[PDB]
Amino acid sequence: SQIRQNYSTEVEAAVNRLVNLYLRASYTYLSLGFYFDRDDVALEGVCHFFRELAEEKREGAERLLKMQNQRGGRALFQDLQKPSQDEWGTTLDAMKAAIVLEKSLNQALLDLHALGSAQADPHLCDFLESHFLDEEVKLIKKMGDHLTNIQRLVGSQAGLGEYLFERLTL
Amino acid sequence: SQIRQNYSTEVEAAVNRLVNLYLRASYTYLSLGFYFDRDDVALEGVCHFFRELAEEKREGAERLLKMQNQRGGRALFQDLQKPSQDEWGTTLDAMKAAIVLEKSLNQALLDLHALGSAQADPHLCDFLESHFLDEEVKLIKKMGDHLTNIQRLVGSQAGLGEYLFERLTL
Amino acid sequence: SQIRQNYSTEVEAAVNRLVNLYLRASYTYLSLGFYFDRDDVALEGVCHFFRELAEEKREGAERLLKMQNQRGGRALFQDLQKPSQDEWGTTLDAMKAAIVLEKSLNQALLDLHALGSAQADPHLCDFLESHFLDEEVKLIKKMGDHLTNIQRLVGSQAGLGEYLFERLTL
Amino acid sequence: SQIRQNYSTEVEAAVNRLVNLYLRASYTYLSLGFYFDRDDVALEGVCHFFRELAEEKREGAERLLKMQNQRGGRALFQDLQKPSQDEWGTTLDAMKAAIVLEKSLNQALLDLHALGSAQADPHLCDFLESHFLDEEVKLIKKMGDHLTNIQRLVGSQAGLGEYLFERLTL
Amino acid sequence: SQIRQNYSTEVEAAVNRLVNLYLRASYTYLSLGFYFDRDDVALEGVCHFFRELAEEKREGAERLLKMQNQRGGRALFQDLQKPSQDEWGTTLDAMKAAIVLEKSLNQALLDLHALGSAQADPHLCDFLESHFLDEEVKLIKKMGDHLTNIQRLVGSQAGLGEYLFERLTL
């Protein structure tokens, strides 16, 4: 590219892989959202929590793609793997799966940051620090807060706690 | 009628029967609403849910009657059977009876649509698709969502769950 | 009932019978309204006059039911008899049937008031005097005014008078 | 056409024929409107009723033509036959001719709907149900209401009734 | 009195006794309100419910006194007995005591109405029907609704139900 400067093939490829990870996460959240909209699940606040995350992950992918083009790299898309489950269990099961998913995205961001640092690519490092690393830390903290509250609500009567958390937190 | 065109005696009669079904459903909901207003039942959100449905069903009957006259058919009214119960039990019992009632109305709409299609009456088919079929599907989905939430709230202590659902959902 | 005080079984039963009378009157007015909406009758102001009365009678039934529950009585619903006619003739015939209907409702209110007085139930007597007795007298006077005007318009050419009354009074 | 999909030559031709019918109806209404504007006829409300219908029919033709192009069919225009009369008689004669005209348009819509159904063309069927079938039913009902009122006004003194209907309904 | 007309000594005395009953009820509610404000009771919505009733009962006494003077009777005040308890137990115990209190006031109103009727004092009868009888019926119905909800919340864990009712109803 006429514009490409200080942008390694290693980072370009890692950015494409990260786009796939974010789009896969968006797909997972789409599935989680619609599962909580089933008439036999019926937890509206949980559906809305995950549908909003599906949008956030798609937006992250789009920001990565815009950056790929700003740097002169070339977007390459791969198949998007279906989500790991068809049914997602309780809100507790879903929130545990979500935190696993976000930790995996955060680890991929940290890996890319390390690659950027190894490649002496400070534009990349700034980009991740600005738009991604803090968002992930904030989201993971929120999910951990939710997991703690969901868990405190189980002990006695799980259906009651599940309803209350959806009504009063989400 | 000077205006009647492509409107079978079969559809005319079925529309009169459907008006009776909607008015009967309105009556059932009136009874459900006032039962939840009893001082020894006292669930205001449940009363309001059913009173609003009584109004919706009456409005459906009125829309059918307006259509009967637009097509040149003749409204014929029959006695309105009293509702199937005098006392309606818990919110769970009432919501189960309501879903049974709406499924019966939906089946009567589907039957009328099939008759319209057999009679090559596309105005009828459009009328039902526009003002009735989607409303029924949406309402049945809402009731199923409510039934799932009511059921999740029972397990432990039924009075507590009944209060919470009325306070926090309805 | 934990709340019931000075409320006789006789009044409770009479209130249920009165609810049936008001709902039947509402049904009669629904039928009158839709008859005047027929393309071969086509008197819009007459349809609107009766449709508004159908709503007023339903509201009266609902006020009686609310009162039944306020006093600790128990609503009991019976079948609703179909209206006395399928076709209602001229505006004059319909207005005569309406005044007969309202006089019958007024007589049932007066009977209930007499029962309340015999049962020393001043809350009932106030309730009827406040929300029902004056409304009936006002409505009967209006219908008598209409009957006089309709009758003055017949003599010559009945179709002309029927049109003029609908256009210029209703 | 590069865009044409599931659009039969039979429907394309029937749509062109229907455009001709709507434009002919518009022409008929133009003639009716100007007849009622003659100084020796002089019924302004009747002129305005028909002039508004001339505009509605032209708009229907234009909507059909837009649809023809959306589907990749080709508009073909034919001569427009002059209206069936040069003078239109009384308002009663004109309203009878109008209802005959609208019933013929409605029958052509129903025929086209049947053809669409035979051709498995649901876009066509939706298009007619949405923009045409209900409009025709509503208009025919209005004309039948008018015919009933005009007829009730004749009996006695026809000029008087004709004036009153124009003044007080139209 | 120069103004006194048709106002019996029996009614005058009964009105003074009724003022004492209303002021005593106001005192009882003052005590109930402050008990629920104790740091070891601490149910704010219950305190506010009873403090508002203390004000309503005082206002009722003041309306009776204004009426006594309008009729030319003479207000006579007696000692006000302290409330029947110093501590009021749970919200359920308090609401049961409140309904007992209101039923006693309602019975005193009904007795006074009967005396008015025996004395042929229609001004008195109107006064009670207008400002007192309906208010009592409405209040008793509300308290019965509350008692039903409190009772449904006990079964399982009484502290939890007591908190929830205060938070979500009052």
Side-chain angles (χ1 to χ4, degrees), chain A residues 81-92:
Chain A
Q81 263 209 308
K82 78 176 185 180
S84 69
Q85 301 175 216
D86 296 323
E87 299 166 29
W88 296 97
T90 60
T91 302
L92 178 53

PDB file of all heavy atoms in Angstrom, chain A residues 81-92:
ATOM      1  N   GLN A  81     -17.575 -19.345  13.078  1.00  0.00           N
ATOM      2  CA  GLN A  81     -18.028 -20.514  13.813  1.00  0.00           C
ATOM      3  C   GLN A  81     -19.314 -20.219  14.564  1.00  0.00           C
ATOM      4  O   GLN A  81     -19.458 -19.152  15.162  1.00  0.00           O
ATOM      5  CB  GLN A  81     -16.992 -20.903  14.873  1.00  0.00           C
ATOM      6  CG  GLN A  81     -16.004 -21.980  14.546  1.00  0.00           C
ATOM      7  CD  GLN A  81     -15.579 -22.699  15.859  1.00  0.00           C
ATOM      8  OE1 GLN A  81     -15.173 -22.047  16.829  1.00  0.00           O
ATOM      9  NE2 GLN A  81     -15.740 -24.023  15.905  1.00  0.00           N
ATOM     10  N   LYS A  82     -20.255 -21.135  14.492  1.00  0.00           N
ATOM     11  CA  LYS A  82     -21.445 -21.049  15.317  1.00  0.00           C
ATOM     12  C   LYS A  82     -21.102 -21.003  16.825  1.00  0.00           C
ATOM     13  O   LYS A  82     -20.067 -21.510  17.251  1.00  0.00           O
ATOM     14  CB  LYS A  82     -22.400 -22.215  14.995  1.00  0.00           C
ATOM     15  CG  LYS A  82     -22.066 -23.539  15.566  1.00  0.00           C
ATOM     16  CD  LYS A  82     -23.166 -24.520  15.223  1.00  0.00           C
ATOM     17  CE  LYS A  82     -22.910 -25.848  15.902  1.00  0.00           C
ATOM     18  NZ  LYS A  82     -24.006 -26.831  15.550  1.00  0.00           N
ATOM     19  N   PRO A  83     -21.976 -20.401  17.635  1.00  0.00           N
ATOM     20  CA  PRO A  83     -21.704 -20.397  19.080  1.00  0.00           C
ATOM     21  C   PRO A  83     -21.603 -21.781  19.681  1.00  0.00           C
ATOM     22  O   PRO A  83     -22.122 -22.768  19.119  1.00  0.00           O
ATOM     23  CB  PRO A  83     -22.898 -19.618  19.655  1.00  0.00           C
ATOM     24  CG  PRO A  83     -23.345 -18.751  18.466  1.00  0.00           C
ATOM     25  CD  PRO A  83     -23.205 -19.678  17.290  1.00  0.00           C
ATOM     26  N   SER A  84     -20.966 -21.842  20.843  1.00  0.00           N
ATOM     27  CA  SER A  84     -20.576 -23.124  21.450  1.00  0.00           C
ATOM     28  C   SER A  84     -21.767 -23.916  22.006  1.00  0.00           C
ATOM     29  O   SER A  84     -21.654 -25.111  22.224  1.00  0.00           O
ATOM     30  CB  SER A  84     -19.576 -22.874  22.590  1.00  0.00           C
ATOM     31  OG  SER A  84     -20.208 -22.228  23.701  1.00  0.00           O
ATOM     32  N   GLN A  85     -22.909 -23.254  22.223  1.00  0.00           N
ATOM     33  CA  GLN A  85     -24.127 -23.905  22.736  1.00  0.00           C
ATOM     34  C   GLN A  85     -25.331 -23.455  21.920  1.00  0.00           C
ATOM     35  O   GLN A  85     -25.313 -22.391  21.351  1.00  0.00           O
ATOM     36  CB  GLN A  85     -24.365 -23.539  24.226  1.00  0.00           C
ATOM     37  CG  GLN A  85     -23.172 -23.964  25.095  1.00  0.00           C
ATOM     38  CD  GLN A  85     -23.252 -23.539  26.545  1.00  0.00           C
ATOM     39  OE1 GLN A  85     -22.233 -23.206  27.151  1.00  0.00           O
ATOM     40  NE2 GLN A  85     -24.461 -23.556  27.108  1.00  0.00           N
ATOM     41  N   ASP A  86     -26.373 -24.291  21.886  1.00  0.00           N
ATOM     42  CA  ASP A  86     -27.665 -23.904  21.334  1.00  0.00           C
ATOM     43  C   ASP A  86     -28.638 -23.413  22.396  1.00  0.00           C
ATOM     44  O   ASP A  86     -29.549 -22.653  22.080  1.00  0.00           O
ATOM     45  CB  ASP A  86     -28.309 -25.100  20.619  1.00  0.00           C
ATOM     46  CG  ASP A  86     -27.493 -25.564  19.410  1.00  0.00           C
ATOM     47  OD1 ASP A  86     -26.911 -24.726  18.685  1.00  0.00           O
ATOM     48  OD2 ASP A  86     -27.453 -26.789  19.187  1.00  0.00           O
ATOM     49  N   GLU A  87     -28.479 -23.938  23.611  1.00  0.00           N
ATOM     50  CA  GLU A  87     -29.305 -23.520  24.777  1.00  0.00           C
ATOM     51  C   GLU A  87     -28.318 -23.132  25.861  1.00  0.00           C
ATOM     52  O   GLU A  87     -27.277 -23.766  25.995  1.00  0.00           O
ATOM     53  CB  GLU A  87     -30.146 -24.707  25.257  1.00  0.00           C
ATOM     54  CG  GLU A  87     -31.128 -25.267  24.211  1.00  0.00           C
ATOM     55  CD  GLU A  87     -31.709 -26.647  24.589  1.00  0.00           C
ATOM     56  OE1 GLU A  87     -31.841 -26.944  25.789  1.00  0.00           O
ATOM     57  OE2 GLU A  87     -32.017 -27.427  23.663  1.00  0.00           O
ATOM     58  N   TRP A  88     -28.644 -22.119  26.667  1.00  0.00           N
ATOM     59  CA  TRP A  88     -27.652 -21.499  27.524  1.00  0.00           C
ATOM     60  C   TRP A  88     -27.915 -21.633  29.019  1.00  0.00           C
ATOM     61  O   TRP A  88     -27.160 -21.073  29.819  1.00  0.00           O
ATOM     62  CB  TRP A  88     -27.511 -20.036  27.142  1.00  0.00           C
ATOM     63  CG  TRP A  88     -26.963 -19.858  25.724  1.00  0.00           C
ATOM     64  CD1 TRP A  88     -27.694 -19.635  24.581  1.00  0.00           C
ATOM     65  CD2 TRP A  88     -25.582 -19.923  25.326  1.00  0.00           C
ATOM     66  NE1 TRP A  88     -26.840 -19.566  23.494  1.00  0.00           N
ATOM     67  CE2 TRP A  88     -25.549 -19.708  23.924  1.00  0.00           C
ATOM     68  CE3 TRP A  88     -24.380 -20.120  26.026  1.00  0.00           C
ATOM     69  CZ2 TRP A  88     -24.344 -19.708  23.194  1.00  0.00           C
ATOM     70  CZ3 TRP A  88     -23.177 -20.114  25.297  1.00  0.00           C
ATOM     71  CH2 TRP A  88     -23.187 -19.908  23.898  1.00  0.00           C
ATOM     72  N   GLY A  89     -28.941 -22.386  29.409  1.00  0.00           N
ATOM     73  CA  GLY A  89     -29.123 -22.711  30.833  1.00  0.00           C
ATOM     74  C   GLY A  89     -29.732 -21.539  31.600  1.00  0.00           C
ATOM     75  O   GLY A  89     -30.657 -20.873  31.164  1.00  0.00           O
ATOM     76  N   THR A  90     -29.261 -21.381  32.820  1.00  0.00           N
ATOM     77  CA  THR A  90     -29.735 -20.282  33.663  1.00  0.00           C
ATOM     78  C   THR A  90     -28.984 -18.979  33.376  1.00  0.00           C
ATOM     79  O   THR A  90     -27.956 -18.971  32.678  1.00  0.00           O
ATOM     80  CB  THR A  90     -29.483 -20.634  35.138  1.00  0.00           C
ATOM     81  OG1 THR A  90     -28.081 -20.821  35.341  1.00  0.00           O
ATOM     82  CG2 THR A  90     -30.256 -21.917  35.527  1.00  0.00           C
ATOM     83  N   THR A  91     -29.455 -17.878  33.973  1.00  0.00           N
ATOM     84  CA  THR A  91     -28.723 -16.625  33.854  1.00  0.00           C
ATOM     85  C   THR A  91     -27.307 -16.823  34.401  1.00  0.00           C
ATOM     86  O   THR A  91     -26.374 -16.285  33.847  1.00  0.00           O
ATOM     87  CB  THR A  91     -29.425 -15.514  34.683  1.00  0.00           C
ATOM     88  OG1 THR A  91     -30.766 -15.386  34.219  1.00  0.00           O
ATOM     89  CG2 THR A  91     -28.764 -14.186  34.483  1.00  0.00           C
ATOM     90  N   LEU A  92     -27.156 -17.604  35.471  1.00  0.00           N
ATOM     91  CA  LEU A  92     -25.836 -17.858  36.041  1.00  0.00           C
ATOM     92  C   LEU A  92     -24.937 -18.569  35.009  1.00  0.00           C
ATOM     93  O   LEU A  92     -23.793 -18.151  34.813  1.00  0.00           O
ATOM     94  CB  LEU A  92     -25.965 -18.683  37.323  1.00  0.00           C
ATOM     95  CG  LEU A  92     -24.666 -19.067  37.992  1.00  0.00           C
ATOM     96  CD1 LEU A  92     -23.755 -17.876  38.262  1.00  0.00           C
ATOM     97  CD2 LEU A  92     -25.039 -19.833  39.272  1.00  0.00           C
TER      98      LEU A  92
END
